[PDB]
Structure formats: structure tokens, C-alpha cells
Design a protein around this ligand. Sequence first.
Ligand SMILES: CCCCCCCCCCCCCCCCCC(=O)OC[C@H](COP(=O)(O)OCCN)OC(=O)CCCCCCCCCCCCCCCCC
Ligand SMILES: CCCCCCCCCCCCO[C@@H]1O[C@H](CO)[C@@H](O[C@H]2O[C@H](CO)[C@@H](O)[C@H](O)[C@H]2O)[C@H](O)[C@H]1O
Ligand SMILES: CCCCCCCCCCCCO[C@@H]1O[C@H](CO)[C@@H](O[C@H]2O[C@H](CO)[C@@H](O)[C@H](O)[C@H]2O)[C@H](O)[C@H]1O
Ligand SMILES: CCCCCCCCCCCCO[C@@H]1O[C@H](CO)[C@@H](O[C@H]2O[C@H](CO)[C@@H](O)[C@H](O)[C@H]2O)[C@H](O)[C@H]1O
Ligand SMILES: CCCCCCCCCCCCO[C@@H]1O[C@H](CO)[C@@H](O[C@H]2O[C@H](CO)[C@@H](O)[C@H](O)[C@H]2O)[C@H](O)[C@H]1O
Ligand SMILES: CCCCCCCCCCCCO[C@@H]1O[C@H](CO)[C@@H](O[C@H]2O[C@H](CO)[C@@H](O)[C@H](O)[C@H]2O)[C@H](O)[C@H]1O
Ligand SMILES: Nc1nc2c(ncn2[C@@H]2O[C@H](COP(=O)(O)OP(=O)(O)OP(=O)(O)O)[C@@H](O)[C@H]2O)c(=O)[nH]1
Ligand SMILES: [Mg+2]
Lengths: 174, 347, 320, 82, 97, 48, 63, 50, 52, 52
Amino acid sequence: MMLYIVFILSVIFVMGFVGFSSKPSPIYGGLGLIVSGGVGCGIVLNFGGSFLGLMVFLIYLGGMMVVFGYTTAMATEQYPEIWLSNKAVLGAFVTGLLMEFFMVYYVLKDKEVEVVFEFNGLGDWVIYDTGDSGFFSEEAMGIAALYSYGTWLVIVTGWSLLIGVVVIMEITRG
Amino acid sequence: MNPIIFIIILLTIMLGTIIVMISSHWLLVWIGFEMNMLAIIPIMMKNHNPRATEASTKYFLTQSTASMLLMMAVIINLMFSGQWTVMKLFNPMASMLMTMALAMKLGMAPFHFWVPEVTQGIPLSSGLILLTWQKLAPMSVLYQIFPSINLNLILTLSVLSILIGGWGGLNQTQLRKIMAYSSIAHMGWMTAVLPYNPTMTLLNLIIYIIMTSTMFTMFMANSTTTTLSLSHTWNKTPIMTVLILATLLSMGGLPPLSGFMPKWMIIQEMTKNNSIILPTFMAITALLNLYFYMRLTYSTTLTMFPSTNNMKMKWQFPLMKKMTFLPTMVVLSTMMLPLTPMLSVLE
Amino acid sequence: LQYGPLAYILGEKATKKMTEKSKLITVDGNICSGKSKLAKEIAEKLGLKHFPEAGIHYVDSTTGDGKPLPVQFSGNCSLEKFYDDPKSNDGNSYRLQAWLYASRLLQYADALEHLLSTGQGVVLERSIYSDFVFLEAMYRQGFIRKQCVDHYNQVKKVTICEYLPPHVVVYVDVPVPEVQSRIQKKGNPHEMKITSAYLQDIENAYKGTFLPEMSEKCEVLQYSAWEAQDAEKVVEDIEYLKYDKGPWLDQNDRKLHKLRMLVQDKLEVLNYTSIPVFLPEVTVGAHQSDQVFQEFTELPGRKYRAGYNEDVGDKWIWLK
Amino acid sequence: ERVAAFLKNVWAKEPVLVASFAIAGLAVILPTLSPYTKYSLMINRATPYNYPVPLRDDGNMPDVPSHPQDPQGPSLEWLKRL
Amino acid sequence: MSMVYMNIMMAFTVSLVGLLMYRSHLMSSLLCLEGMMLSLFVMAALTILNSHFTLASMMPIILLVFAACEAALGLSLLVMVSNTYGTDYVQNLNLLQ
Amino acid sequence: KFYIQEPPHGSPNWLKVGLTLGTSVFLWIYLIKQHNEDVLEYKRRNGL
Amino acid sequence: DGPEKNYERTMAILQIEAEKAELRLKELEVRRLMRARGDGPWFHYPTIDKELIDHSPKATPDN
Amino acid sequence: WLEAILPKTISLAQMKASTLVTNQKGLIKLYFLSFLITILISMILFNFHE
Amino acid sequence: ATFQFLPDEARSLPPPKLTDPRLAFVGFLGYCSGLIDNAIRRRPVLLAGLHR
Amino acid sequence: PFFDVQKRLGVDLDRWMTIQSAEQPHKIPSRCHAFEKEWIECAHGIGSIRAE
Ligand SMILES: CCCCCCCCCCCCCCCCCC(=O)OC[C@H](COP(=O)(O)OCCN)OC(=O)CCCCCCCCCCCCCCCCC
Ligand SMILES: CCCCCCCCCCCCO[C@@H]1O[C@H](CO)[C@@H](O[C@H]2O[C@H](CO)[C@@H](O)[C@H](O)[C@H]2O)[C@H](O)[C@H]1O
Ligand SMILES: CCCCCCCCCCCCO[C@@H]1O[C@H](CO)[C@@H](O[C@H]2O[C@H](CO)[C@@H](O)[C@H](O)[C@H]2O)[C@H](O)[C@H]1O
Ligand SMILES: CCCCCCCCCCCCO[C@@H]1O[C@H](CO)[C@@H](O[C@H]2O[C@H](CO)[C@@H](O)[C@H](O)[C@H]2O)[C@H](O)[C@H]1O
Ligand SMILES: CCCCCCCCCCCCO[C@@H]1O[C@H](CO)[C@@H](O[C@H]2O[C@H](CO)[C@@H](O)[C@H](O)[C@H]2O)[C@H](O)[C@H]1O
Ligand SMILES: CCCCCCCCCCCCO[C@@H]1O[C@H](CO)[C@@H](O[C@H]2O[C@H](CO)[C@@H](O)[C@H](O)[C@H]2O)[C@H](O)[C@H]1O
Ligand SMILES: Nc1nc2c(ncn2[C@@H]2O[C@H](COP(=O)(O)OP(=O)(O)OP(=O)(O)O)[C@@H](O)[C@H]2O)c(=O)[nH]1
Ligand SMILES: [Mg+2]
């Protein structure tokens, strides 16, 4: 059912993590992370985080992961080893999926599972806010507040990014 | 490195630490650690050799992993308390992660493996920052979250560090590895007393920083990085051998030297809490450190090792390194025991 | 101000003083090849500072009052003893060579410090780049052990890598019989005991190893004994070099600041010349080392840092 | 005079950078000189995002209107004529 | 707790185990490090959004910015390692034993 | 001139000597002035 | 020194040392109670300041 | 009792322990794998997460 | 107070005497640092740099 | 904080984001505003040992 979209997305989220955490060639490991990032945006979108979700696409996927793939093409791999051709990767990949499936199978059946900690299974929709009718995006109001409340956050973040430029040039000079 | 850039990078290291120590918000604490790590990598890389590259890589992975665990603890805390204030944590699972994250940053055993390797792979001046200034930020957090720390976990980390640091140093001839294992053992004493009296953690930290800075400065003055290189100092700077002798005996906790004071005050605090076996075990295990400090004194000061003919050329040239604050640091490293009650300024 | 980062930040940059005449020139050749004369003429014509070949007492000439010190403070290295008893059991041969390399290493630093600090070029007679030819000749005649060669290469490996090579290498090729004839003419009693085989090994080391290597990164000019006499022609060739090889083209104010920070600190220059490699020829035991050092501190103006010796007339010590 | 011949050189050799620095300079200076900058804060204030919760009348509030169309309270007449 | 927290917490653990169980490529560990950050961002955003804690809305962005700058430093060290040995294999980084 | 080269400390750095004596003088004046004010404020608060 | 000077000097020493011993024992007892009850100035671990709370009317009424 | 607390017996023990502590491969892979074992037994054997 | 070295209430206490034995010891430590400064730089230990 | 520079200088560097019942843009309340507000006021100034 559509009421479980967030749970369904979070299930795919985990499989994507098993995909690259079993560590195939970093070409495919990067692909597994891109799919997890897209699913991660989907989860954040359904909790009302439109701006935060699109930052995942714009910054995490369109920025950081492009550079990861770019660097992989130069310094790591150019051709990939056949996916799952290694026993360790396949074993880890199969191990994660089965653990994930057993978690999902039981929570769905019981509407609650106890994987180490207690988790409900009624649906994520049940914890949502009930009354809302402001004429603005609260999520947008908070991020915009960075420039009126977070003077300190801007300064240290701005400084760190400038230092990142300086440092990376020092590191790579040789 | 351009001298202006080097100063700016050094101030960023300091600023990252300061942010951690003045923040009341966990996000700003995490930002401080991130900033600090960003600026420390260039000074580890500044001599551009494969060993420096390996050290910086091993450092980056360890600190990055720890900062991820720190953020995970912060978010778990947010889930169960709905706030970001830097203080005790409100979930036992968050406390274990934060404690392990900070133990990883400090290099305490059994997360200690990086400290000897990173210190060996970077210059002496970088090792001085790594083993002194870099302890301030993690210790200042531990100082604030200790009420929620699991007692068994923190004391286990302390005991293992004293054992690992003591045993690891026995097999070392490299001066930077000796200092690294000395550091691991001394972090153990600092965290053992943290649950009982955080003031004694600060006292041990400050005194440790002074003596460690003294040793690194004296190693830099002569460009010595090995035991045998240090054994030539008698035939060049005889005074330096006496200072090295006194500082090493102080680091060994021998009365009446300054390095006795932190061990002495820590034993007092734990006995007041009816903890007798732990202080006794720690003091005895600390004799392992005293052994390989004494070995250095034998090859450096109390005996005259063989020299080389080309050393005569060095007799004709003066010592031109800055040696900044060495006369002050060495005096504080050795002669502060009569002023021990002054530890209340830290209260 | 004493040179350092503060002086550098305030404008003391090498490129602001180095011109097109800021060249390091080294003159090389076999024994009795007239290189000393040619080197002296190039410096005069080009207005460069001339550095005589670094001998046993070169360090003595740069410290204290400049006069040579007794031989005990040089380690009893003797070039005269080397000719008379090249295979002596006191290890004089390698001890001399290890000492001479250190003296050249110091002189090269003095030369580079001069060039980077004033912008004026310098002329050297051999250098740490060509010192090995004597080591190879010594080894090939059985004068030194193989382990001595290994120690020499260990020291050379961690020292030469810090310094840039000469801008110009001037080689004066005098055939061995001609040199063997000039040594006899020079009337030096001990030097006359040299053998052609030793002289031939020296020549082979230049042509086999030195000249081909320096050509990869330097401007190499070669001459015969006759072609060498024409100093104006040699200086004419130098002034018409292109300079398109070697690491000097990659240098900038930043890198030269680090180089100047090294060459100005003589103890940092000599740091690795006394690595603890216990080799009988160069190893001195504690008792002899101790008492010789005590004697050194008793020499005039040597107990204290220069400027704080009352016995040589220093004043205002209580304010210095 | 020394600065005048400096500007002529950059204008001839680096006009793109001269424009950049000038535009950025205007962006930092003009808000302090403009007479309209004060209306930017006023307009932003006047926009009512949240409900204006009425006060409990204690009888000692002569400056608080009893009705939106009463003559007390902040006015936006300045904004209409803006 | 809600269902989603189960899987998001699990994703962080999976990437942590992946990071601590190295293979050969250094890049593969940097990916697991960035996977941990992804799950942290999602976990924090969900908590902050659900609780309507408005000023904290900027926090996930700050986390993303610093982490990406931190990932840039990691990639710079990877290329320097790769320029030395021709690969990014972590078994080459054993000089300091 | 005994030395073949001018020593770095052949002549005292007069400015630095002036700074050194000036700092010592200032610190002693500040301390005594501070100590005197501590004594007076100590007696005012306890009514001596 | 005469025997009366030493004798009464000993009493002054004993009084100081005895008083210090009593104060040392009280401090251990005071510290034990403050730590167990948290009702004293020592072991006063911080709690969130209530002056950070916003008391103005919110966008919605139920809070 | 003699064999237990001789200077030679105590010295050998620490010497043996020191070689166990210090004889490491220097590999990132092994050190981090030991981190994983440490965290698991912290929660499974000692309940440091409680 | 918070983050104050000597809060205002500390002014009720008598000041340390300038002849305090601990203060003399601290002064002695400073003197020793002066001598070690001369020694590491091979100056005449007792006479060199009285201003320093 | 380890060094409470913020309180001592009277400058708000990061206390504004620490809790969800603090001032928010446009007076938007958090879902648990009244609960956090009540707990903070109960626990204010008595210390975490007593507050627990
Ligand atoms: C007061 C409360 C605090 C109490 C705690 C104790 C504090 C004392 C520790 C202070 C810190 C150590 C500083 C000691 C100063 C040493 C200076 C000295 O005595 O002379 C060193 C001597 C001189 O050498 P040099 O100047 O280079 O040339 C000599 C030519 N005239 O150099 C030499 O000639 C080398 C001689 C060979 C080495 C001999 C080693 C044995 C002597 C060591 C004595 C110092 C031991 C310190 C341990 C504490 C002692 C209780
Ligand atoms: C290095 C591995 C990293 C893996 C990280 C995995 C994510 C961990 C998520 C931890 C969040 C849940 O954490 C756990 O939640 C339950 C729910 O109330 C708490 O509650 C549980 O413990 C206490 C014990 O008195 C009580 O609340 C209650 O008896 C019990 O239900 C736990 O005290 C808390 O530790
Ligand atoms: C007006 C305020 C508006 C805000 C502007 C925002 C601040 C941006 C700061 C950028 C600072 C750049 O500063 C710039 O540095 C270079 C240094 O090479 C200087 O340029 C100098 O170096 C270059 C080398 O590339 C030479 O070719 C050039 O001849 C020389 O003048 C410029 O004169 C200066 O403009
Ligand atoms: C390397 C760091 C570089 C940092 C550069 C920072 C540049 C900042 C430049 C402008 C900053 C302030 O910009 C502007 O200045 C004027 C100065 O009175 C302010 O004041 C102006 O607006 C207010 C608003 O009511 C009016 O009351 C006032 O009469 C008017 O003068 C503006 O409100 C402010 O928007
Ligand atoms: C009651 C508490 C007592 C605490 C004592 C303090 C701990 C001291 C730790 C010293 C441990 C290491 O000490 C070390 O022992 C071994 C003895 O095998 C010595 O080693 C020597 O003996 C062994 C055999 O016996 C030889 O193989 C070896 O070649 C030789 O060097 C080392 O030279 C010594 O440095
Ligand atoms: C690497 C560079 C390091 C340089 C460090 C320089 C320190 C900079 C200090 C920045 C913080 C200044 O101090 C802080 O500023 C912001 C904005 O002005 C103020 O914040 C203001 O904006 C919003 C509006 O409600 C709220 O946060 C608050 O209501 C209000 O006071 C804080 O009241 C003040 O405490
Ligand atoms: N063993 C050894 N002898 C050296 C070294 N450099 C110079 N000599 C000796 O020093 C002596 C004189 O040096 P030369 O310059 O080559 O001869 P010269 O006649 O004085 O000088 P010119 O004729 O002008 O070339 C020679 O016998 C050399 O063998 C060296 O590095 N090692
Ligand atoms: Mg000659």
C-alpha cells in the first residue's frame, strides 16, 4: 500500500547500502550509493522536506558523487570487475539481503519487530503532525533563518570552506 | 609552505579546538572537530614523502570514522531528548558511541594503533601538535559528558591504554614511536580519574602537555629522531643531555619531580572513593614506562656512546634553532612539585 | 633582521635580487689540471665570488678567527699521509674522504647562501657533485673497503638531494700522462708518489659517470689544456649559454626561501654527515671524543657562542 | 594622480576585473547611502505571516484599537503612498 | 520507534561495517564513509522535520557541506596515494609498521 | 676584529634591551600598584 | 630552647594539625552527601537555562 | 616461587608481551577489523551500550 | 561567575604578601629558567644578558 | 561549554539552536513545545542529579 511508501523506500535504502558496503568495484559501489542517495531524497521528501531532499540531488548526487565518479575514472578504476565475481562481495551481498528480508518479513506480519531495539510497524504515517495551515514552508523558514540567527554558523562554515581550498592546494602540490 | 599560509593553517587548527571548548551546541562541537582535522592534514603532509602521505591517510580515516560516530551519537541524543545542548547525554547507546568516538580521537587503546604510525610518519614539529594540542578538544568534551559515561567502559579503556602504552614502548628505538606509546599510557591515567575528579584529569593533561612539549622541543633542537642519533648529544650539547635526563625522570613519575604530581593526585582521588586495586595496578604498570625512559637516559646522559669523526665539524657552529619556551618548559617539567596545591586554580 | 619567515614576509625574496648573472659555476678536472687558475679567471672576468677548493681546513676558515686549527680537531685526516700510506690501518684514507665530502657540503651551502642572499654568482673548484670520483678511484685501487663506499653513498644520498646542481659545469680534460708529467714538475714530494692507475680511475669517473649525469641537468663545457688557457673564450661561451635544463627553472621565491632556510643553518646542513653508522675508519670512541672536545672548548674564542668571549675582547656581555 | 594612472592601466588591460571590483564595491557601499534602505525593513515587518492574537482588555490600553478599523494601531498609509 | 528508524539505523550500521571491513581499494572505503554520512543526513532530517523543530532545519545542510568538504580532502589523499604506487590499494600503505 | 665574520651578537640589540628593561619596569609598577589596591580594597570590605 | 617554649610550641603545632584533620574528615563527609543528593554547590551538573524559552504567542494556539 | 618472581622471569614476560603488542603488520585493513571486533564484544559480552 | 579568573568576591580576601615563600620559589624558578636559557645557547651562564 | 565565553561576553554564538522551545522564525512552534517548556522549567537551576 501507498501508506507504506516511506517504509518501502527505507527498505530499498538498506539494499543500496548492502550493495556498495559489500564493496564491489568502486564503479558499481558508486552506483549503489547514487541509488541510495536518490531513495534517501525520496524518504526526506515524504516528511515534508522538499528543500532538504533536493539538496541531496543537487549537492550529494550532482556534486560530491560526480567528483567521486570523476576521481574513480582517473585514479581508481577504468574498467570494472564483473559484478559479484568475487566470493567475499557476493557473500556479504547475500548476507545483507537475507538479514534485511528477515527484518522486513517479521515487521510486516506483526506490525512490529524487535531487532535489538523495539520498532513499531503500524506505518510511518501515524506519527505525523495533524493540524497545519500556515501560509509558508516551515522547512524553508528554518533554512532562511541561517542568515538572521546563524551568523556564527555562517562565519565558521565560510571559513572552513575557504580553508578547504587552501589545504587541498597544499596537499596536491607535492 | 608559504610562511603566511602556515600561520593561517595553524590558527585554523587552534580555532577548531577553541570552537569545541566554547560551544554549547553539539553541531558546533562537531564543526570544531571537522575544522581542526581539515587544517591538521597539511602540516602532516608538508614534507611530501610516501611515509607522510601514509600517515595523513591513516589519520584521516581514523578521525573521519570517529567524527561520523560522534555525529551518530549526537543524532541519537536528539531523538531521545529533542535538544542539542553539550552536556550529559540522554541515551545509553549515544553515550557508548560518543565515548568510543572520543577514545578513537584520543588514540586510547584498543583504538591506539594509529598513534605510533602517524607520529612516526610526520615531522617532529607536527608530532608535537598531534600529541599535545590535539588532546585538548576530545578531553574537553569528556570533561562535560562524564556523568553519563559508562564507568566500566571508561575504566577498561584506561587500563588497556596503560598496559598497551607501557608494553609497546619497550620494543621501540625510534624516538617518535616512544613518545607515541608514552602518550597512550598517559591518556589512560587522565581518563581513569575522570569519573571521580575531572579536575585531576585537567591537571594530568596540563602537566603531560608541558613535559611532552619539552621532549619534542629538545629532540627538534638537535634534529634527533632515533635513540642512536640522540646518543651523540653528549659530544655536542652536554647541557641538553642533563635537561633530557631530568625531563625523562619526571615523565617517569619519580619524586621530587613535577611528573610525580599527577600520578600522586590521581591515586589520592581514587583511594578516597575506596578504589585501591585500580590505583595500585596502574602505579605498578607505570613502571614499564619508567623502564624505557631509563633506557634513554642510559644511552643519552649517564653513559657516553661512541662518536664519529665528522662530529668535530659540528663543534664549530652554534645551535640556531628557535627552541621557543624551552627554558621555561623544562623548569616547569621538573621543579613544580613544591607548588602542587596550585592545582586548585583548575577547580 | 636575521633571515627567516618574518624577513621573507617583508619582501626578502630571492627573485628580487637574482639577475641573469646569478649563476653557480663549478670547475672540474683531474689533479694538476690547471682548474684552479681557470676558476680564478672566470670569477674575475664575470664578477663572481671565487671559492678555492675546500680542503681539510675549510671549516676552520669560516669560523672563529679564520685560521686553521691544530690537526687533532680535524681528526688527523692528512692528504700527505694518504699518498705515503694509502692503505694504512688507521683508516686515514676514508676518514679523509668522509671529512672532505663534509667540507665540500659545507662550502656548497656557503656558496648557495651567498648566491641566494646577494644575487651574485659563485665559482667553485669541484663540489659535492663530483667528489665521488676520488672515492671511486680509492676503491678501485684497494685503498678503502667496500663498506666505506656504502657509508659514503648513504651520507651522499640524504644530503645532495637537498641542493640544486650548478648552473654551469666546466670540465678541463688533461690526459693522464700530461697530468702525470705536471705532477712531477710541480715538485711536491708526497704528490709525486701518485700512480697513473689512480689518476686513470679519477678520469674514468668523470667521463663514465660525472659528465654524462651532469649533462642531463646542467650546461657542461669541456676544454683541453690549451683551450683552457683562453679564459676570454671560456667566459664568452658561458655568457652565451641558453639555460633550458635542470631544476633551477622550477624554482620560485617559495622554494628558494626553504632552500635558504636550510643552507644558512650549518648544523642542519651537516646533520646527516655524522649518522650513527659505526664504521671503524670514522668511528671515534668516547674517551678520545670527550677529551678532544674539552681541548676544543679551550681554544681562544671557542668556549662560548661568538660574541660572548671576553678573552678575545667581546664587550657588553651583561647586555647581550 | 598615482592612483589615476593605475586605474587607466587596469582598465586597458583587465577591464573584466575592473568591472567586477567596481560592481562588488557598489554592492557593499550603496545600501549605507541609499535613502530607501529603511523601507525594506518596514515592508518586511508589515507583512503579517501569523495571526495577530488580540490582547485582554484591562482598561489601561489607550493605544490598542478595539476594532481593526479604529484609528489606533500601526498604519500602512506610508506603504500605499510608497 | 517508527519503522523508518529501523532501516535508517541499519543503513548506518551496514556502511560502518563496510568501512571497518576493508578490501583493497581505498576508494571503496571512502564510499562507505560517505554512505554513513548519507544515512546521518536522512536520520537527522526525518527527526527534525517530524518534530517541527524549525531552526534545526539548516542542520542537515551544514552536515552535508562539512562532510563534502571532508570528502574532498579524502579524495585528495587518495590521488596522492595513487600517484605514488599507481593504485589506491590500502595494502601499499604499510611503510609505517 | 678577532672574528673572521661579524657575529650576530657582536653588539647588543639596543632596542630589544630597551624593550626588555621597559617590560620589567612596567610589570613591577603594575604589580605593586595592583597589590596596593588589593590591600586597600581588602580593608574597605572588612572595615579595617 | 627551654622546655616550656618547646612544650607550648608543640601544643600550637598539635592544635593546627588536629584542626586540619577534623576539617579533612568533614570534607570527605560533605562531599559524599553532596554527590549522593546533588543538593549542594558541588557536583552541580548543568541543566538547560529556562531564560532561553520563548513565551510569546505562537503561530498556533495549543502550546 | 623462585621461577615465578625472578628478575629473569618478570623481565621475559614483559619482553614477550611487548613483542605481542608491537609486532603488527601496519595494514589499515587489520587495524580497522580489530575496531569492529572491539565494538561487538563491547555490546555483546560487556553491555557497554547499557 | 563564569569564565572569570578572579571573580569580584575574591577581593574580600587578603592579598598574598609580596614576601610570600611560594612567590619567592616562583621567582627562583624564573631565575633558573634564565640560567638554562644561557646554557643551551652557550652564553656565560651567570653574567650573560642581565636584562634578560 | 568548557570555557563559557558566550555567557561571559554576553554573545549568543549557538544557544539559539540548542532547544526547540527557543525563539523560532515567525513564532512557529515545535510539536513538543509545551512538554519541553515544562521539563526545562522544572529542572532549571537544581542540577542534573536532582533533576533526574
Ligand atoms: C627545587 C624543587 C625541585 C626539586 C626537583 C629537582 C630539580 C632539579 C632538576 C632541574 C632540571 C634539570 C636542570 C639541571 C641543570 C644542569 C646544568 C648543569 O649542572 O651543568 C650541565 C653540564 C654543563 O655542560 P656545558 O655547559 O654544556 O659545558 C660544560 C663546560 N663547563 O653538562 C655536563 O657537563 C654533562 C655532564 C655529564 C652528565 C652528568 C649527569 C649526572 C648529573 C645530572 C644532574 C641533574 C639530574 C637532575 C635530576 C634531579 C636531581 C635531584
Ligand atoms: C557501532 C554500532 C552502531 C550501531 C548504531 C545502531 C543504532 C542504535 C539506536 C539506539 C536507539 C535506541 O536506544 C534504546 O532505545 C530504547 C527505547 O526506549 C531504550 O529503552 C530501553 O532501555 C531503558 C532501560 O531502562 C528503558 O528505556 C527501557 O527499559 C528499555 O525499553 C534504551 O535505553 C535505548 O538504549
Ligand atoms: C571593492 C570591495 C568589493 C569586495 C571585493 C571582494 C574581495 C575580493 C578579494 C580579491 C583579492 C585579489 O587581489 C589581487 O591579487 C593579485 C595578486 O596577484 C594582484 O595582481 C598582482 O598579481 C598578478 C599575478 O597574477 C600580476 O599579474 C599583477 O601584475 C599584480 O598586480 C591584484 O592587484 C589584486 O587585485
Ligand atoms: C571579508 C569580510 C567582508 C564582509 C563585508 C560586509 C559588507 C557589509 C556592507 C553593508 C552592511 C550593512 O548594510 C546596510 O548598512 C546600513 C548602514 O546604516 C544599514 O542602515 C540603513 O538601513 C536601516 C534599516 O532601518 C535604517 O534604519 C538606516 O537609516 C539605514 O542607514 C542597513 O540596514 C544595512 O542593510
Ligand atoms: C613488582 C613490579 C616490578 C616492575 C618491574 C618494571 C618492569 C621492567 C620491564 C623490563 C622488561 C624488558 O627487559 C628486558 O628483559 C630481557 C630479558 O630477556 C633483556 O634481554 C636480554 O636477555 C634475553 C634473554 O634473557 C636475551 O635473549 C636478549 O638478547 C638480551 O638482550 C632485555 O635487555 C631487557 O631490556
Ligand atoms: C574565522 C573568523 C572568526 C571571527 C569570529 C568573529 C565572532 C563573530 C560573532 C558573531 C555573533 C555576534 O553576536 C550575535 O549576532 C547575532 C546577529 O547579529 C545576534 O542574533 C540576532 O539575530 C536573530 C534575530 O532574532 C537572533 O539570533 C537574535 O534574536 C538576535 O540577537 C545575537 O544576538 C548576537 O549575540
Ligand atoms: N683523496 C682526495 N684528494 C683530493 C680531493 N680533492 C683534492 N684532492 C687532492 O688535493 C691535491 C691538490 O688538488 P688539485 O686541485 O686537484 O691539484 P692542484 O695542482 O693543486 O690544482 P690545479 O692544477 O689547478 O688543478 C691533489 O693531490 C688531489 O688528489 C678529494 O676529494 N679526495
Ligand atoms: Mg687546485
